[model samples]
Target: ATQDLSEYYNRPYFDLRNLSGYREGNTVTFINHYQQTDVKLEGKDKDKIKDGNNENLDVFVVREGNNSIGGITKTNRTQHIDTVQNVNLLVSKSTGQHTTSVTSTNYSIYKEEISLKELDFKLRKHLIDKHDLYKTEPKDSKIRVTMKNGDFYTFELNKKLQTHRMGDVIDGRNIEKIEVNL
Candidate 1:
């Protein structure tokens, strides 16, 4: 069934976070989950890089939601996922703004009944933390993740990967499948 995110969602208002990665010895880097909400993202980075401070680590918002997930009745909202092929989440350097591109990644997304409506009217959502339900890779590889909700996602970078933590409310527990691309 097609859920009205404006009223049927709770808990999370867009639960987008990064997965983490680690080293196999001396040739690995890792990335961890971080919030990108209009409220908490900026504060995530506390101290500025001290050394020459030449590293320009960019920021992005990665996430999945239960809205229009799979097993969801077809002919309803099976077309709302907006994965990398279609609608993409993008961050602009000059404007310092995030926008969803119009490219749809041929994915089907649906929300679980557990989804709730937040006070600001955003869909309450979460992701499985760093565990059996998540995936990660070395500092320069990629990880492809598919959820029980029928959504397919991929992460690539020179830094290690970081999945959600073990006890995250929605960031890690609800996940069903994950793949690490080395």
Candidate 2:
């Protein structure tokens, strides 16, 4: 879930939840895009995305802050970047960096519209199923989900969802989930 606190990560982080299934229920899952856009290509940072081979203006997805995760492709199983080592993309604007604000969570910035391989299958089984479940085309709807296990999470849609946007670690009292046994 986008805003829900993960069991392992107590902080109010994004895309840290491990989904076990997309069973016949609705759940707001968090998709991570490691900030691994091809640097020269993305025109993001004069900083760094990756060196060598990635010199084209190609868009990539990446884990916003977590290093272990890599850039996620819009459609899973299609393109998978093994690692990401940068911040979320920003508009240089030929000026200072400007925000594109795209999600309910301040972190998410934009939704990359991509062609999912199993477009209908994936949506019906997982990832934003509410709309399809009810069989109603939304005039406009915010995707939200209540985990079958009783946890609540919403897709951090809107903003650029990548590890690059990660910031200060906040308190965990509100999250209230920790596996002491493990």
Candidate 3:
């Protein structure tokens, strides 16, 4: 069964579009343009509050960590974004490397208003090419996107075709089964 995420979304939330920040180590400094102030979040377990004359910002880390076991290493990071359509997009990226295994699991969400092909093109040009995230071909990679309705679309770079190919649309109800097993 799909977990009811309504309660999680119902909580007082901050729009990601209104804020931006950079992360250094375990600390993130958020620049709140809505409140015209800077707020810092340290570690994954601590929550910080920003006081404003009109309203207060309740800030907290969703998830972050690094772990290794049986010669396999993994990193996890989470980010949140709110689209103009008032949809919450949760972005997660996990990278793992080992002597026998190397994988990159990238997840992103956007409103259904945008086409998947368009988003894939922009992400490749901006994230991969512009930022040079991967200088050479990776051993294995997957880019996953979840829609507002909890439908998932996975993409993989097709080196021979020189384009990204849609793998499949996995229903969100079985999302737990797709957990990284490395």
Candidate 4:
């Protein structure tokens, strides 16, 4: 049975924060259930979704009934997710600038129920400290991470065969060896 997708709709208003990555070893792995909404996408936007390169457009990851993750991008986002659970990457004519009415906009996305271990995320240095997530070298070649809710993670880097970004490590789980690259 096809699920009723209309339940997931966008609001009419939004702050600048709702709209708008790289690495080192500071990227953290986490996941959240997002607000599902049907968005009207476009030709290039569809390509962007498939390619994971969304620069000019905006994206928001809904968490705990709030925009826990929101930002603009121009990089590959395929690494930020483990398996795409439910998604509706459609093209809308009136999406942009976060609005209150759902049908009023052009671009909007749906829920991406990803895995906790498959989320590769990075933020500003200050924001990292603000949110309590970061990377530190407790030992040579190995990076140590302390999560927001008091979790400790440690891993080593091996960029010999193929160099990987933080998203790749978090989202790409089938690989033999891995760790997040900020």
Candidate 5:
């Protein structure tokens, strides 16, 4: 009546033909499903996650190994469910002063570990505004930052690498650069 897509998962991508249902004897219907989308936290999705405080992040599920599994908990209903014990939790924050990190329990098993600082620097270098133009002086370290669609931030930097946002940014006289972004 049904067959799994074990062969298709090996390739980069796969497609199913018009064969959308089963008819071994009588008849049955089916649908393609997977946990490959980002679910933003709001209203009911917020309540299902059960224990996160930040309102500016998306809680998503990632499947990698054949073993790891997880799901989204809820007081009223199932937000999401997977094979693992805990669903992945990733949240970030940025206020131009720059502070955030993304981590997961089963991430390393499927992905190569990368330097967060390096990735942060790389991300700050690229920011797009509604005008579709670069909104900050990448060289002067003067940038307008929109953090997770939360806030607009501005920071000033001197040649010595000292930061002054609103007035003071970060500490370190021998700082190489001051970066601020989402």
Candidate 6:
């Protein structure tokens, strides 16, 4: 039986401001509902050392819609919604300390739903801040967004403030050109 998803389809899935991360060496670790993942910032080749002066990096994971109900059917059918969850003032760098102690409070940075525009802006700011801290052009940092069907959309970020979608581009302007070959 198909549930009435009219209201659900129209609403944003999760808030974007809930995304955050802590850095270790060149890797940024994020703890989400699915898993505690480590995103290594060793460039596309995974061999370059691309660490910034700041000991932390902000991360954002944007999805099209909720996939918990009808699965891919709901995922492929919804209008692509992109909106900033909310904006917060950038925080200053904290004192350098290696503390492995993580409380439940530190893992509260989990949410869904985000606009590609706002995501782009935040990624750009992240890279810019990295550059400011390192005093050099920041190397590429990869961020992965999980699609409703469980597929992953990988984006590459560099000091230029550009988000490059790996394998395929998901720009809304060219929506008609996108073919879901699955």
Worst 10 residues of 5 by lDDT: 107-116
Q: Relative to the true structure, how large is the alpha-carbon lDDT of every model? A: 0.24, 0.23, 0.30, 0.25, 0.24, 0.30
Q: Per-residue lDDT tens digits of candidate 2, residues 98-131?
A: 5322212111212232111111112223223222
lDDT of 4 by residue, 79-128 (tens): 44434232221112212265322112111122222112122222122213
User: For each candidate, C-alpha RMSD in Å?
Assistant: 20.1, 19.9, 18.0, 20.7, 20.6, 21.8
Of the pair 2 and 3, which is ahead by TM-score?
A: 3
* Cα TM-score of candidate 5: 0.15
For model 6, residues 73-156, the per-residue Cα lDDT tens digits are 001223325531222222233223642221111111122322343333343444244423223322433434444344544334
Error of 4 at 50 (Å): 9.6
After superposition, the stretches of candidate 3 with alpha carbons farther than 4 Å from their true spots are: 1-112, 129-131, 158-182
Model 1 over residues 85-176: C-alpha lDDT tens digits?
22122211111145322212222223221111110121012212212111322233334444457665454423212222111112122344
Tens-digit lDDT string for candidate 3 (1-182): 00112222122323223234333433334454344322223222122222322122222221111110010001112233542233222323333353343234333333222333333433444334333334444334444555446666554533211111211112222332121111
Q: What is the lDDT of residue 18 in candidate 6?
A: 32
Candidate 4 whole-model C-alpha lDDT, 0 to 1? 0.25
Please give, for residues 21-40, the per-residue lDDT of candidate 5 as tens digits: 32122212223374232222
List TM-scores for all candidates, in order: 0.21, 0.19, 0.30, 0.18, 0.15, 0.24
Scored by Cα lDDT, where does model 2 land? 0.23
Q: Judged by TM-score, which candidate is best?
A: 3
Which of 5 and 6 is ahead in TM-score?
A: 6
Clashing pairs in 5: 69-83, 69-84, 70-84
